Amino acid sequence: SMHWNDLLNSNRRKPKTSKGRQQIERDYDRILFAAPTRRLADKTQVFPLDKNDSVRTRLTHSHEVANLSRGIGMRLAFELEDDVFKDVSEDICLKRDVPALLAAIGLVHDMGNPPFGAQGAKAMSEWFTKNLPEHSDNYKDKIYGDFRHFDGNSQTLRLVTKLQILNDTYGLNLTYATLASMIKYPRSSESDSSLWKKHGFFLSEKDVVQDIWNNTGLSEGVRHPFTYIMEACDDIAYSVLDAEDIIKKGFASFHDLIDFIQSNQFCKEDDVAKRVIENCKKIHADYAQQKLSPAELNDMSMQMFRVYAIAELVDAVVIAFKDNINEFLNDTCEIKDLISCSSGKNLCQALKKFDSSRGYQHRSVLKLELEGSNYIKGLMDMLWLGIKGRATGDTQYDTPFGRYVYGRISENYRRIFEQENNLPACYKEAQLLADAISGMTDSYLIALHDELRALHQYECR
Amino acid sequence: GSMHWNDLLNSNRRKPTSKGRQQIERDYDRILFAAPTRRLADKTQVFPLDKNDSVRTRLTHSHEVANLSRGIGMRLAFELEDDVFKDVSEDICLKRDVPALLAAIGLVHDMGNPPFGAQGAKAMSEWFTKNLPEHSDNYKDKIYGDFRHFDGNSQTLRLVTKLQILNDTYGLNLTYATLASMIKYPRSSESDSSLWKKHGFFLSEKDVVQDIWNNTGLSEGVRHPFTYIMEACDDIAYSVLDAEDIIKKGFASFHDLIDFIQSNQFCKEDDVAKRVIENCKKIHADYAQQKLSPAELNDMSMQMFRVYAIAELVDAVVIAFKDNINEFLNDTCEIKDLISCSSGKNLCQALKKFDSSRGYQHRSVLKLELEGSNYIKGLMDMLWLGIKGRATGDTQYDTPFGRYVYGRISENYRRIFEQENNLPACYKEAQLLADAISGMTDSYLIALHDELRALHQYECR
Amino acid sequence: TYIMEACDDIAYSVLDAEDIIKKGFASFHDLIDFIQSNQFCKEDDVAKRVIENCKKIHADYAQQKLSPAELNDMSMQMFRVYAIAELVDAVVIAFKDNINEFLNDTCEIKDLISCSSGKNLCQALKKFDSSRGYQHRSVLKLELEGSNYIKGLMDMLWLGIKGRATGDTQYDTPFGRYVYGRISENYRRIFEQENNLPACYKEAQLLADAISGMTDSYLIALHDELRALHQYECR
Ligand SMILES: Nc1nc2c(ncn2[C@H]2C[C@H](O)[C@@H](COP(=O)(O)OP(=O)(O)OP(=O)(O)O)O2)c(=O)[nH]1
Ligand SMILES: Nc1nc2c(ncn2[C@H]2C[C@H](O)[C@@H](COP(=O)(O)OP(=O)(O)OP(=O)(O)O)O2)c(=O)[nH]1
Ligand SMILES: Cc1cn([C@H]2C[C@H](O)[C@@H](COP(=O)(O)OP(=O)(O)OP(=O)(O)O)O2)c(=O)[nH]c1=O
Ligand SMILES: Cc1cn([C@H]2C[C@H](O)[C@@H](COP(=O)(O)OP(=O)(O)OP(=O)(O)O)O2)c(=O)[nH]c1=O
Ligand SMILES: Cc1cn([C@H]2C[C@H](O)[C@@H](COP(=O)(O)OP(=O)(O)OP(=O)(O)O)O2)c(=O)[nH]c1=O
Ligand SMILES: [Mg+2]
Ligand SMILES: [Mg+2]
Ligand SMILES: [Mg+2]
């Protein structure tokens, strides 16, 4: 029974330019002009430290997700407006707010992801599992599960709300609609839930999220309706474009993907998959007549595969959203994802399985991921020498290497760490380390690791 | 004989899905999903091969320009519609077409820029000056001036029209409005126009551009009105953002920029410059109270200077466009640029001068540009061994190194090179070399140069 | 010799495709699609039988929990068996049918494969190897490197070989004498034999015999060592 008036709340958290621009539009400008958005250009999606420049990075993936979300917003505002946007106040300009909101929401997702992709985050978690023992009295509290089960969504929210500090504790000061629709999992690490398997915000954001809920009609475990659209766009985008990158790299062929989709027990009779396969086969028959090398033929065929699969999946997602709009607006929505409720469920699942089999588990990818895990763990080990004990009071950081390595951390991150709040000291220093590591690009991480290892030779005997 | 918005917003395509998406909107998707768009992430804007991940690259520059153009289009369509768009048929929806058209035009504006920035292009030109001598009868014709004065816009047009070939001769098959608006300088190298100092297309596109004009009501010399918007957005988004990058790199300080603007002869009494300086000083006074390092203070002061300057310049550009819309719609418009006819001319010119003084002409920048020039010239010398004589008939390319080098060139560019047309053979060879080199990223160019130099050790004797 | 040529063609056409699949340059389904989409193998009975048997075995193989690389490897392991058996049987049948023509004093048969029922499958496999195995980035780069190595080594050896038989004493430089001493003694012994061959022909034959007999690693090592030893005379 949620109302679109509060779901599209244009107010901002900071207590009270902008010439001919809605506040939601200004949120997109704030997100785009932020340093983490630019740093996304050197964060891995699937293949780390890739030499090929046509393979998706985190920034290109984010922009493509934003474009897909903006297209869905265009299809929802200029069309089907009377079907999903019922009982909306006249002051709200849907045609300008909804597409901008979806585009900004898609762009801002994966902003806080750690370097080296998902396997990077695991590495961080593993470090936080060893250096923050659960049996230890200091870290026995379950709030430290924010670090032992580290994920990029909570870091994205922290970055957009606290880390991007200029002179206030409100970060980028995004609108309530963007902050509400940015939370992919409305639950904390301490809270237990079966609907969501991942925490969506840190303990430090627990009040902030509450504020957002109080200003949007949401609550714990209830997602903003546009969060489902953003998640569906994210899934579609990475599932298709990772397959494109795999085939372009040469790890697989276009016929390999076609045979995988055809032989999948779920896509064998799926109408969307059948239509996509038929169109791709029809275009590939025409393409094969040209005098092309096999690699060029594969890339040409999979560009049309991109077009057809993206169009079909986006249409299915829009239809599913329009059909289940009442369910999404319910105060007790239980939908896991928009893709599962659409007809493109089987095709997306098959694409994800193909990306896992021929992608993530490739030999070069695995070796690069092990190297990145070693780099990340070494960097966190060296940073902990300068971070640990700074907030509790123990002066183990007073060594020259500790002081220098504390000086190498982000200044705004240290300002947030040096703030006076109710967070426990160990949580504060662990959060500082998590922010520092997750804010780094791959190349910056390698360079800093090498430099600090060179500078650590004396204190490491 | 003023042009009409019906012809200027022509959504037809050159070639003789689409579920709820306008054609101009689909042009943005075609541009964004194109490989060169994401290859722009590794092409220099000002600082070549910069280790700082926050310094703007060509992709971030293009995205910022696209966002600014989309904002201006939103202002033009949603707000200033009755005074800017007149006698517009109901078939074209301005609210969806104009913002999308401007966003696509801004995103595509620097797709074909050569590696290592403008200086890199200069390097290419220098090589084409030596290896295609004017006194030689083979290259005596003025058409080869397309290569002696190589520019990124000419390469971008042929990239979006011919180089992105799958099975057509129409490239990405963009709409006529998108193709017309992307032509920054509507003149060829052979043509002698005093209005435009640079050619905007090669001889190979001489027919194609003509077609665009025939379908848009334009002509040689006259420029699409939205191209002025794109040029103004590009100028603003590089003038401000390059200054921000200069401050971030440590080459200058916030007070340095403030003093440069205040001491500027034209910005001394400029109202826009005075307003920007006053607002920045007011914010910086509050910012200086907090315990901050000088670098962080400069960074977060420039973070507000960027917001204020971008807002003021965008508003001034929109006002200038609205005031002079009749002149821009004239068949014989003579306006050089939108910035110069606006109230933000002085501030933008001063920012460009500041970037020239502090950003370029810097020791590290100059050294890196010389290294990039050497790299580009060596790579082009190596590729000319495998390219020269391929079309004329001279079998000097038949050495094993020449065959391998030809095989290392992009298959799309080779496919376009081997097409049957009326272009001169020497022109085709030089165009193949220019297309191969201009599309490379910096890292790819360095890697290919090193690998081919290692492989050339025998034939170089 | 026709039997040998047919066996050579079969044993490289099938085994090079297997090597292509093993290296990861292509997949088993890629080869199956290439054979099925081939113009001549579209209706070839031997190709149809091989494809059907391979598909039947691969359907059973795909049930087990396997990585894609292992599935491709063990599917091509059965494709090799089926294709080799069919091609060998076809070659034997063709030889038996045309034995009288092969025993003719003026036989004109180009090859045993082309006159057999396995011509289309072998030709398609050769085309697949050309498309995917050769003309590959790594293969082309390695071949260019090998060409440079071979040409440099032959240039270095020509300094010690040229003029040895004609009479021109341009080989008498210390590098030339050492290079000649580094050539195989069997090939030098054949080169120094007295016969009616032209002196230039003998010198070129000595160089060709010396170079063609080298392995790849030996060629690289000798090229590097002689290039290091040639730094003075190369000035
Ligand atoms: N190299 C490598 N890449 C992976 C792996 N797993 C996933 N990826 C890729 C696929 C995606 O583009 C991205 C993972 O997607 P996300 O982490 O953003 O999913 P998230 O849990 O945030 O929410 P979602 O599943 O989209 O609902 O990295 C892996 O195990 N190894
Ligand atoms: N390192 C370096 N960067 C330069 C130089 N000249 C310009 N840049 C920067 C400024 C711009 O962001 C960009 C050049 O853009 P352009 O002005 O050349 O674009 P275009 O001529 O096509 O149109 P426009 O002049 O902007 O109206 O690189 C230079 O000489 N050295
Ligand atoms: C300067 C820089 C920082 N980083 C990482 C390191 C930190 O984890 C994170 C923040 O460090 P910062 O040095 O504070 O980055 P910034 O000041 O340029 O921009 P902002 O503070 O608004 O984010 O950015 C990189 O990955 N590459 C770089 O070049
Ligand atoms: C693959 C690749 C190409 N390039 C350059 C080199 C060429 O000049 C240009 C085209 O070479 P291609 O390799 O043909 O690029 P692509 O086919 O993958 O994508 P598209 O043709 O749609 O652009 O791209 C890079 O800079 N880095 C790379 O990784
Ligand atoms: C010894 C040796 C020779 N070769 C090449 C170099 C010569 O071209 C060719 C003959 O050189 P030889 O050294 O004379 O070979 P061999 O005498 O041991 O055996 P045989 O004469 O019966 O063949 O063999 C290698 O490739 N690797 C080696 O280790
Ligand atoms: Mg994502
Ligand atoms: Mg530009
Ligand atoms: Mg053989």
Numbering used by the authors:
A (entry chain A): 0 to 15, 25 to 469
B (entry chain B): -1 to 14, 25 to 469
C (entry chain K): 235 to 469
Please, what does the article write about this entry?
pmcDeoxynucleoside triphosphohydrolase (dNTPase) enzymes are effector proteins in animal and bacterial cells that hydrolyze dNTP nucleotides and inhibit viral replication. We therefore named the dNTPase-NTase anti-phage defense system Clover and designated the dNTPase protein as Clover protein A (CloA) and the accessory NTase protein as Clover protein B (CloB). Likewise, CloA exhibits strict dGTP substrate specificity, with the activated enzyme only hydrolyzing dGTP and leaving other dNTPs including dTTP unaffected. Together these results demonstrate that CloA is a dGTPase effector that senses phage infection by specifically responding to elevated dTTP concentrations associated with viral replication. Clover defense encodes an accessory enzyme CloB that synthesizes an additional nucleotide signal p3diT that suppresses CloA activation and protects uninfected cells from aberrant nucleotide depletion. p3diT binds to CloA in an allosteric site adjacent to the dTTP binding pocket and raises the threshold of intracellular dNTP levels required to trigger full Clover immune activation.
